[PDB]
Design a protein around this ligand. Structure first.
Ligand SMILES: [Ca+2]
Ligand SMILES: [Ca+2]
Ligand SMILES: [Cl-]
Ligand SMILES: [Cl-]
Ligand SMILES: [Cl-]
Lengths: 104, 460
């Protein structure tokens, strides 16, 4: 099913955080990395559509990072999709929808 | 730099994106509209991130700027910054900048964000002694000697080719340091940074953490992906609340036993077989114990606040210690030897249940877990107890769906056949075993998976 071999914790970022940025939120993982290298990417508002690059993911490690302080009263939630691909470009998971909730 | 008479905006700021932005800042209608030095002198901050800017030609005229954001653009050359000495904060991550010589005399800077560029030489930073925040990760820095006199630094990040951390020795104002993804093995200099509260140093080649002993203000420590075994030093760090030690070679967890402030603990991909030392860490909400050597996880039942737990790739047969952990929302135990999942019926808050590659035969105990949104039950396997050979040997199908109905076999070895509930073979000669497989899509709550497996039946 959609779960596949994704291993992702819930993602919460306080607003007004201190650097240094970029700051790790969680490590996104597919257990498909047991049968070959996996490379991670994200899409969605805040990643690849405006505001671009508030959130980024390190393609080899799966570290999801925020690049600047957030502001809950401006945008309290973001909806991203995580992707996992093989060296050869093929999807090893179905895109997983990720909620990011901005807190107090 | 001053313009002398009224000048079109788009003759001052030649970059198309920037002149449009400035037209707005200066409250003009068309980019060909005139402005004078009077007008430009009123501009003291500029938020021009994410605008497709390739050149900042013209910013030299904005003599009174104290704060700029040009992050997420396509900047290369930043020469127009050279004489804007009232600048106190620069945000310029995610560009194409290689040469930061233009920042060298911006001595009023307290904040400089330069991550995700193509910087190698940071020599131009050496006299920026009022910096308290300096971010330089996702660059190709190898030499940080230029940082040695930045004695007001509070927050600091750099990468990705640094070995030698000696230049950090006098930076005792440092409170938050991120040295992840460098080439670092020797962190002995970190002993001198006694005000450190947060140290992130993932993906290096650290094996000796004794330098951390006197850094007792540390509340967050990440050493994911190093070469740690002996973590005795960590017992000194009693203010730790978030500790990440995944991807190492750790087996002895006794040094963690007193770290009762911990709410997040990552220990995945280590050499752990004994988790008795974790039994007192009752503030934990997130615990990762995947890819270890675990069988007896009984001490986990103490951790009543856990909402996230990983156990995948161990040797666990008895999952029932997690059944006490009623706040659990995501539970992962792919690749273990669990058969009886009945205790999991007590996990009424569970949303992600990842249980593939176990020995699960019967989904009925899960039927009321309707908050599930993600589910994995692929690739179960078990071997039944031997039964006696007969030419017409028959066994009951035991595979049960969440509804309680038997799942008919998908394939049956040796030309065998099914009539519910019995699988029957017709064997001309003795054979050492027979088997069957099943594969059945199923949804519990909103979570969907294929409940699948292979059942082996040895014959005497
Ligand atoms: Ca706010
Ligand atoms: Ca792993
Ligand atoms: Cl602005
Ligand atoms: Cl891990
Ligand atoms: Cl699974």
């Amino acid at each position: 099913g959609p779960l596949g071999s994704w291993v992702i914790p819930p993602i919460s970022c306080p607003e007004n955080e201190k650097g240094p940025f970029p700051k790790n939120l969680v490590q996104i993982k597919s257990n498909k990395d047991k049968e070959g290298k996996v490379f991670y990417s994200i899409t969605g508002q805040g990643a690849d559509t405006p505001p671009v690059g508030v959130f980024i993911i390190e393609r080899e490690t799966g570290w999801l990072k925020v690049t600047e302080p957030l502001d809950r009263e401006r945008i309290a939630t973001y909806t991203l999709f995580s992707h996992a691909v093989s060296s050869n470009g093929n999807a090893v998971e179905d895109p997983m929808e990720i909620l990011i909730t901005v807190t107090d | 730099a001053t313009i002398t008479q009224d000048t079109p905006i788009n003759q001052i700021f030649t970059d198309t994106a920037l002149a449009e932005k400035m037209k707005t800042v200066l409250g003009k209608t068309n980019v060909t509209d005139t402005v004078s030095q009077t007008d430009l002198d009123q501009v003291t901050t500029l938020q021009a991130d994410r605008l497709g800017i390739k050149s900042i030609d013209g910013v030299e005229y904005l003599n009174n700027l104290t704060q700029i954001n040009f992050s997420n653009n396509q900047l290369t050359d930043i020469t127009p910054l050279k004489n804007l000495t009232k600048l106190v904060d620069i945000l310029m991550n995610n560009n194409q900048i290689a040469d930061i010589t233009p920042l060298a005399n911006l001595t009023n800077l307290t904040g400089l964000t330069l991550f995700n560029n193509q910087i190698t030489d940071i020599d131009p930073l050496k006299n920026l002694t009022n910096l308290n925040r300096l971010e330089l990760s996702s660059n190709t820095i190898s030499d940080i000697s230029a940082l040695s006199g930045l004695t007001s630094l509070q927050q600091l990040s750099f990468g990705n080719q640094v070995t030698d951390l000696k230049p950090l020795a006098n930076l005792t104002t440092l409170e938050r340091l991120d040295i992840s993804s460098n080439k670092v093995s020797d962190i002995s200099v970190l002993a001198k940074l006694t005000n450190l509260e947060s140290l992130i140093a993932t993906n290096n080649q650290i094996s000796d953490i004794t330098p951390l002993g006197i850094l007792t203000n540390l509340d967050e420590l990440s050493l994911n992906g190093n070469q740690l075994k002996d973590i005795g030093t960590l017992a000194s760090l009693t203010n730790l609340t978030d500790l990440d030690l995944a991807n190492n070679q750790i087996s002895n967890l006794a040094p963690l036993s007193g770290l009762t402030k911990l709410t997040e603990l990552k220990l995945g991909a280590n050499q752990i077989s004994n988790i008795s030392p974790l039994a007192g860490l009752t503030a934990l909400t997130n615990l990762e114990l995947n890819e270890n050597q675990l069988e007896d996880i009984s001490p986990i039942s103490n951790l009543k606040n856990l909402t996230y737990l990983t156990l995948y790739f161990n040797n666990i047969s008895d999952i029932s210690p997690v059944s006490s952990l009623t706040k659990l929302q995501r539970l992962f135990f792919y690749n273990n030897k669990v058969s009886d999942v009945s205790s999991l019926a007590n996990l009424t808050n569970i949303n992600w249940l990842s249980a593939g590659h176990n020995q699960i035969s019967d989904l009925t105990p899960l039927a009321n877990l309707t908050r599930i949104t993600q589910l994995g039950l692929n690739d179960q396997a078990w071997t039944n107890a031997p039964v006696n050979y007969k030419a017409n040997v028959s066994i009951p199908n035991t595979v049960k769906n969440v509804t309680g109905a038997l799942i008919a076999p998908a394939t049956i070895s040796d030309g065998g056949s099914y009539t519910e509930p019995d699988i029957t073979w017709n064997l001309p000669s003795y054979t050492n075993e027979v088997s069957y497989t099943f594969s059945q899509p199923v949804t519990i709550g909103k979570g969907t998976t294929t409940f699948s497996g292979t059942v082996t039946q040895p014959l005497k």
